[PDB]
Amino acid sequence: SVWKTLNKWLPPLSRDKDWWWKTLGPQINTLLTEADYDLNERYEALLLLYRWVVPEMGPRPRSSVAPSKSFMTDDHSPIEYSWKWISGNKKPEIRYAVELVSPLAGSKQDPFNQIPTRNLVYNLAKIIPELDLTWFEHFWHELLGPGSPVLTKGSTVFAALEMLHGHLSVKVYFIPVETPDFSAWHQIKHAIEASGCPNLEALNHVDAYLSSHDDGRQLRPFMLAIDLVEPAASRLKIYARSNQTSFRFVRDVMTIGGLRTDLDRSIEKFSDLWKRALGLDPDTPPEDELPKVDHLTSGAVFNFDVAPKSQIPEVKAYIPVRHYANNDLQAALGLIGYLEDHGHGGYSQSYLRGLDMLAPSGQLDQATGVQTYFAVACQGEDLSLTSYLNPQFYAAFQ
């Protein structure tokens, strides 16, 4: 094991850091091994983890009570893994989002725990010269800076590392603090308009859908995600959540009220996957809402990519497995069955072994929580799928 080797020879850590090292290290190493990453990339990922992530994770879990109300996951685990299924039975892409913490979190010097993420981004920029920080600083000052603004989701920023087989990408997520006169969408839209975009036609499409369309008026934007590459090549993901959960609503959102055409085949496959992943009756009417779940992150959630060189925005929908499925094994078998039916499930067993590694001992088939979302994007006539995973440090405290 790469982690066993590194842990054997790297200098020992303090109690808290060692706990994070011996927990996150094996988890990341297992996910990367099952996805067939070469050895050097596993060493690199664990060396980065040991040097720049583990020291900034704060005190180790000691109970089921979390030290913060982090918006990363429902149980406030500050780590979320993701497993992107690549078509053609190619190797999956492993990514992980992290919200680092410091003792200053909550104080006047850092009331919303932003400094650790900024430090991580600059540290990564030192080692990765291809990283561009122009949009990082622009959106940082616009959304979280001294000029920005009561109501908070539990976090305001976090970062993600994407191991794209041979190179590393970094993403940054901003969760604006809302005030009675400055909602999250107002701040995000103003920041994008002030970012120097060549064409803002897709942003206007998203704005018109959100403001005027009956279904689009039911969505509440809350988060913005950018890529730390050249701004012409970076995506602009605008996340929005709604209380409605019927697939008729989900479908209308995927098409942005009919703006996007030629998606009938993809949406049919989406409908099948939605029902299988959630364990719904095959004849469930698309106009029926899902049974009510009352939670901060319940309902249907999406993101709109308003990227340049594309006048029509793209939509990714997230199937909230943790809130509406029966149990993790059932949702996993539905996803894997869909993949098998379309000849895209070469890494299904590897994925199941990863779930077994991540799951709290004896809970896959009786509870939810491990798989947070199944992300679905429509690519022509096929689906692009991603599994998001919560290690559940506190809800499953061992």
Ligand SMILES: N[C@@H](Cc1c[nH]c2ccccc12)C(=O)O
């Ligand atoms: N945990 C928050 C933010 C978040 C993390 N990963 C996500 C993936 C998709 C949508 C939102 C999220 C939520 O569920 O909303």
